[PDB]
Structure formats: structure tokens, C-alpha cells
Fold Non-structural protein 3.
Amino acid sequence: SFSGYLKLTDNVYIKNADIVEEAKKVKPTVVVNAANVYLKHGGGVAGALNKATNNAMQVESDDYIATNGPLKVGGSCVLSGHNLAKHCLHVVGPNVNKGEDIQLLKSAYENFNQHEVLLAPLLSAGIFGADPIHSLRVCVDTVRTNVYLAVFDKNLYDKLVSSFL
Ligand SMILES: Cn1cc(C(=O)Nc2ccc(O)cc2)cn1
């Protein structure tokens, strides 16, 4: 199972880890992708997860978009986890670099409550432009299921743990 995680709360755990390497190791039931509404997995966590699937995630995602249209900011969809997980929960956190409503981050984290356990990144963090300290706070105050957060950046991981209230 998950190893080397620091327990933050009853249900939230955190580790300084590459979520792709963590997914290949754990092979969780659910890996969360930091998706955009178009499921265009170009960069950040999405680009890394997609590259690990040899682009199979993008091929599946394009078929999903062709059939269903784009997701909502704050929404999600369950697709295959390919070689990384049983499922991938593609969750769209607001991208503050695209001027999206930061208040939608709580709605984005609510998607995690539909799954008993997840391996996830901090939503809207990284190239999505939100403050990761704020994202972790929304995560702990919203998610009730067991969430194992992988934070790629060591310096950010240390800042998140040392400032966690
Ligand atoms: C590697 N990495 C660093 C960050 C970061 O520091 N983001 C950030 C954005 C807005 C803020 O108000 C404060 C911090 C995200 N990923």
C-alpha cells in the first residue's frame, strides 16, 4: 500500500513524491489528474501522467470529449488509470492563470468524496496558479475520504508541512 506518508489529519496524508512514480509503485484504485475542461494533458501533473501512459490517457480523453463535451471547472470524470491505477479521476480545479474562480477549488475537491481512497496532487497548485498552502487547507476541510497527496517539489513539501495548521 502507500508508504512514507506524513499524516496531516484523520484522512489526509502527504509525501514528497513524483505522483507518476508513486502511481507506478502503489497502483492505487484511483489516481487523480489535475485536468483542464478539455482533458488536454499538456503539462504539469496531467502532462506527466499522460506521458507515463504512452499517450493512451490522451487518446481515451479525446474520445470522452468528442462524446460528452468539456467538463465544468470544479467537475470531474472517471476514466481508465491505464498502467498507473485502476481509474483516473480527472478533476478540474480553477486555473487562476486563466482568471478562473478560486472559490471553485472546494467544488473540485468534493469530487474526491466519491472515492474511498485516492492518490492525488494538490488541486490548482503548480501551473494552475493557486497558492498550494490554500489548496492543502481546502483539501483537508473538504475531503472526508482517504487522500494521499503527492507533492513533487521538496521545498514546497517542506513549506506545506511546516506551515500546516
Ligand atoms: C513549484 N511550485 C511552487 C508553487 C508556488 O509557490 N505557488 C504559489 C502561487 C501563488 C501564491 O500566492 C503562492 C505560491 C507552485 N508550484
Notes: The chain has one domain: 1-165. Residues 1-165 form one domain. The CA atoms of residues 45 and 119 lie 12 Å apart.
